Design a protein around this ligand. Structure first.
Ligand SMILES: *[C@@H]1O[C@H](CO)[C@@H](O[C@@H]2O[C@H](CO)[C@@H](O[C@@H]3O[C@H](CO)[C@@H](O)[C@H](O)[C@@H]3O)[C@H](O)[C@H]2NC(C)=O)[C@H](O)[C@H]1NC(C)=O
Ligand SMILES: *[C@@H]1O[C@H](CO)[C@@H](O[C@@H]2O[C@H](CO)[C@@H](O)[C@H](O)[C@H]2NC(C)=O)[C@H](O)[C@H]1NC(C)=O
Ligand SMILES: *[C@@H]1O[C@H](CO)[C@@H](O[C@@H]2O[C@H](CO)[C@@H](O)[C@H](O)[C@H]2NC(C)=O)[C@H](O)[C@H]1NC(C)=O
Ligand SMILES: *[C@@H]1O[C@H](CO)[C@@H](O[C@@H]2O[C@H](CO)[C@@H](O)[C@H](O)[C@H]2NC(C)=O)[C@H](O)[C@H]1NC(C)=O
Ligand SMILES: *[C@@H]1O[C@H](CO)[C@@H](O)[C@H](O)[C@H]1NC(C)=O
Ligand SMILES: *[C@@H]1O[C@H](CO)[C@@H](O)[C@H](O)[C@H]1NC(C)=O
Ligand SMILES: *[C@@H]1O[C@H](CO)[C@@H](O)[C@H](O)[C@H]1NC(C)=O
Ligand SMILES: *[C@@H]1O[C@H](CO)[C@@H](O)[C@H](O)[C@H]1NC(C)=O
Lengths: 97, 31, 49, 49, 147, 49, 49
């Protein structure tokens, strides 16, 4: 469901916080299904994505940090209230749609 | 490692004029 | 004859102002409306018109 | 295509005139600058009774 | 002047790129750096030789690496007025760091000499890092140890 | 259904729902955060794929 | 997947023409007068006094 977000001018969790294309992008985008390789019966959680970020990432900009996220913006610890881990794991199963 | 310098003067941020400097080639086309 | 000359000059400038409300194949003649609503790629098509 | 006296820097491959027409190119195999010119340069008129 | 360090937080909480030029070759390293608060090179003034110095403590999770060809650099202290002017333009756009360079012989004693110089593009580094801050890297000439 | 007097922050839709189809007409998706909307209605139904 | 159920929501609205009660997440500022400013009014952006 996130493949459609790999395109210039898109919005979403991937386009905002993970990967963005320029409005004047020149190139090609290729995607193919890998359910046989990247999915398992017990579930594959090795792939992640950033779900929380204060500002949208710029075109072709990358953010590989892992800092606890607070909507207020102050530093916090994960056990504290309103403090989360920005990275969420994809749950890839064989039986997934 | 990570050595520190003691008894340092503040920079005071002196100001100057750019003059005509800072021009760079805008593209790869020969003109 | 002198009045006709001054009338034509004023009429030409007033026609110029009224033609700013003109769409030319665009969604709107208001430049701010287009820019507040579209990306630079999509607004480029309307602004060029 | 004619030999050119233009000197290209290593980061330049094409050249353009004031009309933005590509008039110079560095040959890939042999790094020589060549001049591109239009094939039409004729002023032609026809006289008929 | 040996190079620069460009990064958003200037610690190991984010990626930073170092374009330092050591005595032997130019090194561009975009990595997760535990940057020292006071990074420098050290060349002994009497000896005119470069000895190892630390710019960062540790490096990890790191993406981009480039090493230039070997060349010889003169570390000796020099007398007189300023002899060289090296101009650079750094631009960060679309995940690329554009570096434009130019060189000029000058004889000014102080200030920035007036003039015109066109900088040619030398680098287009595909780093894709957020750059909001930078720090220059200067070499030190310590005459006595501990000073 | 009519929607009024609210803040359209769709970032809360992240991590809760996943849309296979999302297409906007007359507006830009990246422009959705900077706009105020008038007479907004939501139509709900179910179709097949 | 062709014969699986899909829930569809269609949002309809108007932009920059009528009073708006639904707005995107933005922080308002103090009203500055008699100066050239970049203004945003219910999603309508521009420059003026
Ligand atoms: C300036 O920085 C460059 C790049 O970091 C330094 O060059 C690198 O120096 C290291 C240590 O000498 C080299 O590692 C060695 O590689 C050889 C095999 O080539 C191996 O047998 C040694 O055990 C060691 O791993 C590294 O290859 C070399 N990189 C290149 C290609 O230049 C350079 O020494 C620095 N100069 C100074 C300290 O001013
Ligand atoms: C580059 O990093 C800076 C600093 O982390 C980012 O600035 C933050 O931006 C967000 C969203 O506007 C604010 O909520 C924070 O308060 C800002 N922090 C500081 C200290 O300035 C900046 O957005 C980043 N740029 C990109 C696009 O990656
Ligand atoms: C690329 O290949 C071409 C064809 O082999 C080279 O052109 C020839 O080069 C040889 C040796 O210099 C000459 O004797 C021939 O007369 C050349 N022929 C042509 C087509 O002019 C060309 O020099 C090669 N370029 C590079 C990058 O090595
Ligand atoms: C990231 O940087 C921090 C701050 O420099 C490092 O924390 C220091 O770690 C060293 C070695 O264990 C200690 O001597 C310091 O006292 C620590 N300082 C603080 C403020 O905690 C941290 O170890 C670095 N992490 C990595 C992986 O490089
Ligand atoms: C001077 O430099 C050489 C080569 O690096 C070194 O062997 C020598 O010990 C140095 N002498 C001093 C003054 O430290
Ligand atoms: C590098 O990134 C990964 C994934 O975010 C993290 O698990 C790892 O701890 C990071 N590097 C180190 C050694 O801190
Ligand atoms: C989604 O985000 C909410 C916070 O808005 C959190 O409580 C929840 O654990 C997250 N994950 C889900 C719903 O799978
Ligand atoms: C809807 O509510 C259920 C029950 O609380 C929850 O499990 C599910 O994740 C929610 N989905 C959305 C779209 O928030």
């Amino acid at each position: 469901d996130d493949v459609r977000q790999i395109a210039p001018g898109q919005t979403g969790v991937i386009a905002d916080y993970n990967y963005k294309l320029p409005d004047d992008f020149t190139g090609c985008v290729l995607a193919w299904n890998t359910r046989n390789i990247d999915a398992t019966q017990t579930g594959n959680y090795n792939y992640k994505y950033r779900s929380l970020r204060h500002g949208k990432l710029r075109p072709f900009e990358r953010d590989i940090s892992n800092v606890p996220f607070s909507p207020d913006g102050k530093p916090c610890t994960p056990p504290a209230f309103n403090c989360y881990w920005p990275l969420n794991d994809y749950g890839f199963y064989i039986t997934n749609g | 490692k990570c050595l520190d310098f003691d008894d340092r003067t503040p920079p005071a941020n002196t100001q100057f004029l750019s003059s005509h400097r800072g021009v760079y080639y805008p593209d790869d086309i020969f003109r | 004859k002198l009045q006709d000359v001054v009338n034509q000059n004023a009429q030409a400038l007033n026609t110029l102002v009224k033609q700013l409300s003109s769409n030319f194949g665009a969604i709107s003649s208001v430049l701010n409306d287009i820019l507040s609503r579209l990306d630079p790629p999509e607004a480029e098509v309307q602004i060029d018109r | 295509l004619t030999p050119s006296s233009k000197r290209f820097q290593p980061f330049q491959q094409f050249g353009r005139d004031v009309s933005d027409f590509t008039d110079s190119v560095r040959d890939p195999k042999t790094s020589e600058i060549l001049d591109i010119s239009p094939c039409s340069f004729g002023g032609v008129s026809v006289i008929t009774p | 002047i040996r190079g620069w360090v460009f990064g958003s937080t200037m610690n190991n909480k984010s990626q930073s790129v170092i374009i330092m030029n050591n005595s032997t070759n130019l090194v561009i390293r975009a990595c997760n750096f535990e940057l020292c608060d006071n990074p420098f090179f050290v060349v002994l003034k009497s000896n005119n030789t470069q000895i190892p110095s630390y710019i960062f403590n540790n490096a990890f999770n790191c993406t981009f690496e480039y090493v230039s060809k070997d060349f010889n650099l003169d570390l000796g202290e020099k007398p007189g007025n300023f002899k060289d002017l090296r101009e650079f333009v750094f631009r960060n756009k679309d995940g690329f760091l554009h570096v434009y360079s130019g060189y000029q012989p000058i004889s000014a004693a102080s200030g920035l000499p007036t003039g015109f110089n066109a900088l040619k593009p030398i680098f287009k580094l595909p780093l894709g890092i957020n750059i909001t801050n930078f720090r220059t890297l200067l070499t030190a000439f310590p005459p006595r140890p501990d000073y | 259904k009519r929607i009024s007097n609210c803040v359209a922050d769709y970032s809360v839709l992240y991590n809760s729902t996943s849309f296979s189809t999302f297409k906007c007409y007359g507006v830009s998706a990246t422009k959705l955060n900077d706009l105020c909307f008038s007479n907004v209605y939501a139509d709900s139904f179910v179709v097949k794929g | 997947i062709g014969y699986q159920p899909y829930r569809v929501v269609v949002l309809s609205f108007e932009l920059l023409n009528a009073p708006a009660t639904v707005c995107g997440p933005k922080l308002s500022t103090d009203l500055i007068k008699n100066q050239c400013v970049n203004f945003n009014f219910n999603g309508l952006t521009g420059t003026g006094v």
